[PDB]
Amino acid sequence: YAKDVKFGADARALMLQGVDLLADAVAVTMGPKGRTVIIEQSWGSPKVTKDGVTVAKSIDLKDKYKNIGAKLVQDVANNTNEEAGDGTTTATVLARAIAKEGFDTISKGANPVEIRRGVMMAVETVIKELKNLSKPVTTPEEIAQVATISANGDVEIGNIISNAMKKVGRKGVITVKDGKTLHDELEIIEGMKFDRGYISPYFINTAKGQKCEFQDAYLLLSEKKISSVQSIVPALEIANQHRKPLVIVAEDVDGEALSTLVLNRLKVGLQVVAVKAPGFGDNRKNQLRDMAVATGGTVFGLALEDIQAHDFGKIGEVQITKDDTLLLKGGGSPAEVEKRAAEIVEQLENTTSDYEKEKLNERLAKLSDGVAVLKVGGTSDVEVNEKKDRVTDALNATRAAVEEGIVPGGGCALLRCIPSLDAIQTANADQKIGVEIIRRALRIPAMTIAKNAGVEGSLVVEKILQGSAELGYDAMQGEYVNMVEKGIIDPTKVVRTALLDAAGVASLLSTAEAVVTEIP
Amino acid sequence: YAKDVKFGADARALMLQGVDLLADAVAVTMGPKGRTVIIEQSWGSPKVTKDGVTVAKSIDLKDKYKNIGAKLVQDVANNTNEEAGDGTTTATVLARAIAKEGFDTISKGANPVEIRRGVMMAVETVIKELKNLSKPVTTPEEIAQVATISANGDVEIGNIISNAMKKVGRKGVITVKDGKTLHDELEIIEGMKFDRGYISPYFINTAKGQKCEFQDAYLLLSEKKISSVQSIVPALEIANQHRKPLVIVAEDVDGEALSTLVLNRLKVGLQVVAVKAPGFGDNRKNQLRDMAVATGGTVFGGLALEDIQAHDFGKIGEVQITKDDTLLLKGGGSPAEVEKRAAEIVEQLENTTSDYEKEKLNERLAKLSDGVAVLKVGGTSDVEVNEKKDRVTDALNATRAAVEEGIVPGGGCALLRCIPSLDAIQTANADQKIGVEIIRRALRIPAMTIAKNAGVEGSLVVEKILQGSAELGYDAMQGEYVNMVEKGIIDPTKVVRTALLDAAGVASLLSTAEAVVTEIP
Amino acid sequence: YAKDVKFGADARALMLQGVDLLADAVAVTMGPKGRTVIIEQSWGSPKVTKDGVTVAKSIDLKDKYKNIGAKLVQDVANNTNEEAGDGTTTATVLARAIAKEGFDTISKGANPVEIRRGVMMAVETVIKELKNLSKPVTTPEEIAQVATISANGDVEIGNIISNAMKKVGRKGVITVKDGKTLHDELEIIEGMKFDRGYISPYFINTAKGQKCEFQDAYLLLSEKKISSVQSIVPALEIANQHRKPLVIVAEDVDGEALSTLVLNRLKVGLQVVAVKAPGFGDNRKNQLRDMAVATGGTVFLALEDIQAHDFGKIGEVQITKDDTLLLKGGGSPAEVEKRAAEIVEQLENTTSDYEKEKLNERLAKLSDGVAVLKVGGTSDVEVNEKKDRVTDALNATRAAVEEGIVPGGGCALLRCIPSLDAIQTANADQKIGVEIIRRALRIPAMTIAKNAGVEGSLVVEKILQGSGYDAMQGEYVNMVEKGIIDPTKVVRTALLDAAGVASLLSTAEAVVTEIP
């Protein structure tokens, strides 16, 4: 239980060493000419990868302080990845640059608060000019073009993504699953997606995604919090006797019930997953009722322990990831669900609250609008799985592009925001120092990509900055071209979130004046 | 079992090094512009915080003597926090300053007794002039203003705090809990509060922190000391049969009964919490009877144990038991049962003449009649509700302290304004003057630390405040010398007074130690 | 848990040292005059071998980075061996040469991308010239000559291999098995072969390769995936009551069913082997039904009610990681030619080329049986040794049929050097990579000469400046007609795999290893 504490510059230097190691490992994968990282496995052949995310996840340091810094940067870059589908490497390298420059300037006597205030000013200016620079993607032709670009010249993949988006909309739900047909195809089916994940890991998938994948499962709905084991044993035995998976949607599953669910999940292989009910307040119960009528079940909170297996709903397929749950095939009657929406539209014409209208319309969309499942084809199952990974990545990229537009790739989007930093109303010298830190960091992504391509980063950056507009550097072909015209693009959401999160983590490391670790 | 013993300044140096490490960790969080402390969690991500309390709670050194010093200062600061609601960081930094300067002067040959005499003298002078400087908070409008200030400019939180305090009084019972509604609201229900905690760890909610809370529980009250398993098994099985938690209130629960209650709770999962009966002497029996009639149960003292028929149990809708107090919320007792029990107390109030029995009789009557005000915080997200509950709890404790002892200018500027007060002290010898100078240097430390964490140099800021008017301090958030009382930069007088008193006490205790005995590792 | 990472040339040097050790061990076995490697065994006398493959498989280093490099090269060379049947040593030595030269040039300031672009250009040019150099083997006389040459001047082995290939075609199925007769003989029996392996290690034949080789086995076929123990217990009970092995061909066996199956064979020896159903989509179901009618079983109405009339019969089955052989069928012939009539009727109507290929492949599986080679002899030990030799000769002959033959002794690569002089290089680094490949091309012949006793520095120059150094004879002859040949597929795949692994090692800028 012993502790060791370091203070100020001494601790920040160790954490900076950790982030230096992490970003040195990650940055070699940047750009189309990214290099290879070899990661030793516990068993089998070593892993060869150019993926920044898997490289960052594999890094773990022995010394406590540098490990702490690396873990902080890893968490920030990872939550950047989960939002936009990319930008882990960009966030990591930007964070290292900003943290290094800030620690060097602070350790020489600069005021940390007046540096963070000014680093944030430059970041805000860069974000504003980046949003000004973004080219929106709204038309189906633009969507197909972006999807094909993210699919690396696959016209079929871009066309199927564009058709799915046209058929369910930009706000619609799109998922990709393994296809058993030689040709990829999409279809619109009923469905329901809410942003609540599993309470604790019950991965039956036990594979990529860290989710749960049942098929032909039961649905147990309860407004009451389920904590008594005696009130949940009958449901578990009813589900087990029919050998169907059970999905428990309650306000909260905890205590003895959660303990028994975990024990049975790992001892007798019980296929049960507990997920918190979506929403809050009275909207929780309305969403539960809507879900129950969609699945043809009933809600408890009926004594909750007298289940007769007619109380359960039916779920054809369910996918429960960390922060959201997808219910695919409902068991409720179409006449049942169409009448439930009638109540919602009746309440729409009466209630006029802005907050109440949004929730009711979202429930209406959940009941009426379905999900779009596109299945990826191929001549072999491993080809189908690899194409599934590629199509998922392209779909996330296209969703980000529709959300926030596109900007020139190769790090040139951040490079073209440099001239906007020369007109910031800075108060004192430390604010200018922070702005200069951000300005120096803006060149890091493009320079790293150039270095990975083999050419010198400084000269390429100088030519791009002192050259014609929209003239970037295509590393794969080794020539200065128009990036957006020739398709070298990145989603604006990716770069914006990466820069914002890197600045946030760097400022968090700059605010740390003491680090407490455990004596090994 | 071997022991190592160090003497005098040699051991005091190690203990001072420990408190130096602890206070250096804590002080970086001081002030509204405080810095960040990273605490490595054993499992999961590192913990990033600016709270001095959790920073001090997480420090535990390797060497025995410095760990002893750190633990002493931690305990003093922690018991400062429990009584007032804040001042852990202030107490820690003041304690380190006083201990450092006292050890330096004493080790140079000064008399420690005649230094502590004079440190305490100037502490008394500072406290007197602080009470003189304190502005009382008595009117409901002032209470609402203070609550809104403490809630960081949220009008509804201040209004709801002021409404609750108005509805139950300044001496009344207020607790904050999670709310399921989007809108925050307060209501007054029956209740009972007494300063007795759990006998042994029974924490159902470890996340809440050393609290044992559940709903719809049975209650058995025993005048006799429950120490036999045979007499408590029937009650336990009766409570288990109905799937209801059991609360044991008795003169003392110990021995094999306590051992079985702890072991079965840890292993099987018994929903049982044992709490010592409140009061002492003949009053303990009287308020045990009062609790029984308030909850609808009966007192055991043919009314022996192992004869419970579940009609001898009191019913409690909600119970919260913490380390230092217990809260029974919803009583199952009949309203007519309790409205005629208070008649007995009133009748005894005519007979009593001790002028102290009447105080306890009135306290029992108030406990029977006065309820508790529960206010549930609203929000659009459950996590938002939890965080707002924490914020409202902190604001409510600050407002309670302010009502108790008034308010003073914040940012440690009250201690800054008490500096000229001690220039006129009848010092006997030089050592008393030395102690007075030690405390004078200490008085500037909180404001200087807040300024340093803000970025600016505190040495110039303190002198600028001292040489200027008696109303302009330092914002340190806007970096402007402002009228802090009018602008809203205030601190409760109770918090600062207790912080200074406890820091002086722990420094004196650390400077009276002439021998430290540790165990050979 | 804790990780240690090295960057750039520092890590590439450790990996190069590891591959240096591995290739130094392997290269002493190259050529007809290859030297001897003694590998210590856990029990018994040490193993004395001149085989590059077994020496390479017996290398494991203590330091993390050099072991990582050695294992990368090992895996590349091994999967080179599994495709063509030879070239492990060739691939290893070429990989070491290319990696050494490339690392030395890169560490001195060259651009790795502009080196790999140009190394691959030279490799492609060498491949084109090698395919130009190859003499195709298509006639039965040439097939017999190649088989006899591979069999070390064994006329009978060459004759039997050539006859088997003639009787089942060059695309046919040929397997080698121990013979109980004094004289080796072949026969064509009904049989089936598809590229699907065991889901989990199930080897009852622990030695002589990783094989599941039992006889007189039941066969169940399931279109749906099998993951429930409730749906597989009846099959196991039925198979165990009759003391007959069970082969499971399904879409996928995983989860509780797979765990129960793998645990049972370990503890009681259930004699159960599972294998994923071959193919994809509709072709999977069609050929699953074809297999069912070939074995007499039925496809799976559920997995609970099975009995035994729904069980295909397999006389002999051999399952490796990449392919499954079902030797003896159980279905009635009137059932199998009736199914073939439907296949030819469907082929008579369809005109798509891609769909006709799978139809004819299914028809060949149904009708064209497999060919077995029983190897004769006077002792079981000699029969097994001859079986190993004949299997090697058959693999070499089939590779030669695939892509022709080229002069052996490393001369095939040596004769592509003069054709490397005409390459349009963009910059100096591409020329440097071309030079790396050019220097590496001499390495196999040089190693063979060095192991033969003579020094290859003069041997290579004599071979080039003239009109090939048979190492065993010691005289420069024309290797092709003399008999010193290698399959063109072997050298092509070895060169390509060595270049690929060397490029992969050159593109590595960071190695992440675990703290010991």
PDB file of C-alpha atoms in Angstrom, chain A residues 272-402:
ATOM      1  CA  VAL A 272     -27.590 -13.848 -20.732  1.00  0.00           C
ATOM      2  CA  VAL A 273     -26.720 -10.149 -21.008  1.00  0.00           C
ATOM      3  CA  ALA A 274     -27.998  -7.303 -18.821  1.00  0.00           C
ATOM      4  CA  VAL A 275     -28.227  -3.802 -20.310  1.00  0.00           C
ATOM      5  CA  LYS A 276     -29.388  -0.626 -18.581  1.00  0.00           C
ATOM      6  CA  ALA A 277     -32.654   0.866 -19.793  1.00  0.00           C
ATOM      7  CA  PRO A 278     -32.159   3.791 -22.205  1.00  0.00           C
ATOM      8  CA  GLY A 279     -33.069   7.341 -21.293  1.00  0.00           C
ATOM      9  CA  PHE A 280     -33.828   8.907 -17.938  1.00  0.00           C
ATOM     10  CA  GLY A 281     -36.871   9.848 -15.897  1.00  0.00           C
ATOM     11  CA  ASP A 282     -40.321   9.200 -17.322  1.00  0.00           C
ATOM     12  CA  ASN A 283     -38.796   8.796 -20.790  1.00  0.00           C
ATOM     13  CA  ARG A 284     -37.217   5.580 -19.494  1.00  0.00           C
ATOM     14  CA  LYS A 285     -40.612   3.953 -18.933  1.00  0.00           C
ATOM     15  CA  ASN A 286     -42.049   5.193 -22.236  1.00  0.00           C
ATOM     16  CA  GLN A 287     -39.030   3.789 -24.082  1.00  0.00           C
ATOM     17  CA  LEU A 288     -39.448   0.491 -22.220  1.00  0.00           C
ATOM     18  CA  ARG A 289     -43.112   0.310 -23.249  1.00  0.00           C
ATOM     19  CA  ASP A 290     -42.256   1.157 -26.862  1.00  0.00           C
ATOM     20  CA  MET A 291     -39.539  -1.514 -26.918  1.00  0.00           C
ATOM     21  CA  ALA A 292     -41.925  -4.060 -25.384  1.00  0.00           C
ATOM     22  CA  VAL A 293     -44.646  -3.404 -27.960  1.00  0.00           C
ATOM     23  CA  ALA A 294     -41.982  -3.591 -30.676  1.00  0.00           C
ATOM     24  CA  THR A 295     -40.845  -7.010 -29.411  1.00  0.00           C
ATOM     25  CA  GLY A 296     -44.305  -8.202 -28.354  1.00  0.00           C
ATOM     26  CA  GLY A 297     -43.364  -8.611 -24.691  1.00  0.00           C
ATOM     27  CA  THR A 298     -44.446  -6.948 -21.462  1.00  0.00           C
ATOM     28  CA  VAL A 299     -42.794  -4.758 -18.827  1.00  0.00           C
ATOM     29  CA  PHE A 300     -42.419  -5.642 -15.146  1.00  0.00           C
ATOM     30  CA  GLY A 301     -42.287  -3.553 -11.986  1.00  0.00           C
ATOM     31  CA  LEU A 302     -47.044  -8.731 -12.586  1.00  0.00           C
ATOM     32  CA  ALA A 303     -44.669  -9.156  -9.626  1.00  0.00           C
ATOM     33  CA  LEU A 304     -41.644  -9.558 -11.938  1.00  0.00           C
ATOM     34  CA  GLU A 305     -41.201 -13.166 -10.763  1.00  0.00           C
ATOM     35  CA  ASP A 306     -44.364 -14.858 -12.122  1.00  0.00           C
ATOM     36  CA  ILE A 307     -43.122 -14.962 -15.722  1.00  0.00           C
ATOM     37  CA  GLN A 308     -44.938 -17.473 -17.939  1.00  0.00           C
ATOM     38  CA  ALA A 309     -42.652 -17.092 -21.005  1.00  0.00           C
ATOM     39  CA  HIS A 310     -45.413 -15.119 -22.713  1.00  0.00           C
ATOM     40  CA  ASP A 311     -44.127 -12.026 -20.901  1.00  0.00           C
ATOM     41  CA  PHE A 312     -40.821 -12.156 -22.787  1.00  0.00           C
ATOM     42  CA  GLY A 313     -40.293 -10.377 -26.062  1.00  0.00           C
ATOM     43  CA  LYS A 314     -38.554 -11.975 -29.028  1.00  0.00           C
ATOM     44  CA  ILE A 315     -35.316 -10.645 -30.536  1.00  0.00           C
ATOM     45  CA  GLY A 316     -34.133 -12.244 -33.763  1.00  0.00           C
ATOM     46  CA  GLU A 317     -30.591 -10.900 -33.416  1.00  0.00           C
ATOM     47  CA  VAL A 318     -29.021  -8.578 -30.842  1.00  0.00           C
ATOM     48  CA  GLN A 319     -25.616  -6.869 -30.774  1.00  0.00           C
ATOM     49  CA  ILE A 320     -24.605  -5.166 -27.515  1.00  0.00           C
ATOM     50  CA  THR A 321     -21.325  -3.246 -27.621  1.00  0.00           C
ATOM     51  CA  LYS A 322     -19.803  -1.161 -24.820  1.00  0.00           C
ATOM     52  CA  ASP A 323     -22.041   1.904 -25.198  1.00  0.00           C
ATOM     53  CA  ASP A 324     -24.964   0.903 -27.441  1.00  0.00           C
ATOM     54  CA  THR A 325     -27.348  -1.995 -28.048  1.00  0.00           C
ATOM     55  CA  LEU A 326     -28.885  -3.072 -31.358  1.00  0.00           C
ATOM     56  CA  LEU A 327     -32.142  -5.045 -31.394  1.00  0.00           C
ATOM     57  CA  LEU A 328     -32.625  -6.290 -34.936  1.00  0.00           C
ATOM     58  CA  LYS A 329     -35.716  -8.457 -35.483  1.00  0.00           C
ATOM     59  CA  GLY A 330     -38.758  -7.526 -33.429  1.00  0.00           C
ATOM     60  CA  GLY A 331     -41.414 -10.011 -32.404  1.00  0.00           C
ATOM     61  CA  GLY A 332     -44.306  -7.589 -32.058  1.00  0.00           C
ATOM     62  CA  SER A 333     -47.206  -7.386 -34.460  1.00  0.00           C
ATOM     63  CA  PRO A 334     -46.959  -4.777 -37.246  1.00  0.00           C
ATOM     64  CA  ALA A 335     -50.521  -3.783 -36.356  1.00  0.00           C
ATOM     65  CA  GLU A 336     -49.372  -3.496 -32.735  1.00  0.00           C
ATOM     66  CA  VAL A 337     -46.442  -1.202 -33.536  1.00  0.00           C
ATOM     67  CA  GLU A 338     -48.424   0.934 -35.993  1.00  0.00           C
ATOM     68  CA  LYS A 339     -51.045   1.649 -33.314  1.00  0.00           C
ATOM     69  CA  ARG A 340     -48.375   2.574 -30.755  1.00  0.00           C
ATOM     70  CA  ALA A 341     -47.067   5.289 -33.086  1.00  0.00           C
ATOM     71  CA  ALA A 342     -50.625   6.647 -33.235  1.00  0.00           C
ATOM     72  CA  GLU A 343     -50.419   7.491 -29.529  1.00  0.00           C
ATOM     73  CA  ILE A 344     -47.134   9.320 -30.152  1.00  0.00           C
ATOM     74  CA  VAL A 345     -48.549  11.364 -33.035  1.00  0.00           C
ATOM     75  CA  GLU A 346     -51.631  12.140 -30.930  1.00  0.00           C
ATOM     76  CA  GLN A 347     -49.400  13.466 -28.146  1.00  0.00           C
ATOM     77  CA  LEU A 348     -47.370  15.461 -30.695  1.00  0.00           C
ATOM     78  CA  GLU A 349     -50.408  17.540 -31.684  1.00  0.00           C
ATOM     79  CA  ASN A 350     -51.106  18.362 -28.009  1.00  0.00           C
ATOM     80  CA  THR A 351     -47.754  18.826 -26.255  1.00  0.00           C
ATOM     81  CA  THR A 352     -45.646  21.795 -27.350  1.00  0.00           C
ATOM     82  CA  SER A 353     -42.508  21.599 -25.184  1.00  0.00           C
ATOM     83  CA  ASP A 354     -39.331  21.647 -27.266  1.00  0.00           C
ATOM     84  CA  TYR A 355     -37.590  19.018 -25.125  1.00  0.00           C
ATOM     85  CA  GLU A 356     -40.704  16.823 -25.006  1.00  0.00           C
ATOM     86  CA  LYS A 357     -41.144  17.007 -28.789  1.00  0.00           C
ATOM     87  CA  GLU A 358     -37.602  15.784 -29.501  1.00  0.00           C
ATOM     88  CA  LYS A 359     -37.876  12.707 -27.268  1.00  0.00           C
ATOM     89  CA  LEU A 360     -41.315  11.787 -28.625  1.00  0.00           C
ATOM     90  CA  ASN A 361     -40.113  12.155 -32.220  1.00  0.00           C
ATOM     91  CA  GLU A 362     -37.042  10.033 -31.450  1.00  0.00           C
ATOM     92  CA  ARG A 363     -39.290   7.313 -30.010  1.00  0.00           C
ATOM     93  CA  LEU A 364     -41.447   7.569 -33.138  1.00  0.00           C
ATOM     94  CA  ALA A 365     -38.339   7.127 -35.298  1.00  0.00           C
ATOM     95  CA  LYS A 366     -37.283   4.103 -33.233  1.00  0.00           C
ATOM     96  CA  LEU A 367     -40.712   2.521 -33.724  1.00  0.00           C
ATOM     97  CA  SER A 368     -41.133   3.313 -37.435  1.00  0.00           C
ATOM     98  CA  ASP A 369     -37.698   3.708 -39.024  1.00  0.00           C
ATOM     99  CA  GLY A 370     -35.818   0.440 -39.455  1.00  0.00           C
ATOM    100  CA  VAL A 371     -32.159  -0.503 -39.667  1.00  0.00           C
ATOM    101  CA  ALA A 372     -30.270  -1.145 -42.908  1.00  0.00           C
ATOM    102  CA  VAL A 373     -28.220  -4.351 -42.953  1.00  0.00           C
ATOM    103  CA  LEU A 374     -25.728  -4.646 -45.813  1.00  0.00           C
ATOM    104  CA  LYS A 375     -24.054  -8.041 -46.150  1.00  0.00           C
ATOM    105  CA  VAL A 376     -20.619  -8.257 -47.770  1.00  0.00           C
ATOM    106  CA  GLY A 377     -20.108 -10.998 -50.343  1.00  0.00           C
ATOM    107  CA  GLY A 378     -17.080 -12.855 -51.602  1.00  0.00           C
ATOM    108  CA  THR A 379     -15.685 -16.130 -52.858  1.00  0.00           C
ATOM    109  CA  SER A 380     -14.479 -17.197 -49.391  1.00  0.00           C
ATOM    110  CA  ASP A 381     -15.407 -16.633 -45.763  1.00  0.00           C
ATOM    111  CA  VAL A 382     -12.090 -15.010 -44.810  1.00  0.00           C
ATOM    112  CA  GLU A 383     -12.483 -12.702 -47.812  1.00  0.00           C
ATOM    113  CA  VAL A 384     -15.973 -11.885 -46.530  1.00  0.00           C
ATOM    114  CA  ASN A 385     -14.598 -11.038 -43.076  1.00  0.00           C
ATOM    115  CA  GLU A 386     -11.789  -8.847 -44.438  1.00  0.00           C
ATOM    116  CA  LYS A 387     -14.262  -7.072 -46.727  1.00  0.00           C
ATOM    117  CA  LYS A 388     -16.520  -6.647 -43.686  1.00  0.00           C
ATOM    118  CA  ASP A 389     -13.709  -4.873 -41.842  1.00  0.00           C
ATOM    119  CA  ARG A 390     -12.965  -2.658 -44.856  1.00  0.00           C
ATOM    120  CA  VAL A 391     -16.635  -1.795 -45.438  1.00  0.00           C
ATOM    121  CA  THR A 392     -17.133  -0.988 -41.749  1.00  0.00           C
ATOM    122  CA  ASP A 393     -14.143   1.367 -41.859  1.00  0.00           C
ATOM    123  CA  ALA A 394     -15.387   3.018 -45.064  1.00  0.00           C
ATOM    124  CA  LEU A 395     -18.896   3.375 -43.617  1.00  0.00           C
ATOM    125  CA  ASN A 396     -17.575   5.064 -40.472  1.00  0.00           C
ATOM    126  CA  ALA A 397     -15.457   7.384 -42.624  1.00  0.00           C
ATOM    127  CA  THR A 398     -18.462   8.245 -44.805  1.00  0.00           C
ATOM    128  CA  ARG A 399     -20.617   8.888 -41.729  1.00  0.00           C
ATOM    129  CA  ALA A 400     -17.979  11.266 -40.363  1.00  0.00           C
ATOM    130  CA  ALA A 401     -17.725  13.000 -43.750  1.00  0.00           C
ATOM    131  CA  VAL A 402     -21.499  13.477 -43.908  1.00  0.00           C
TER     132      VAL A 402
END
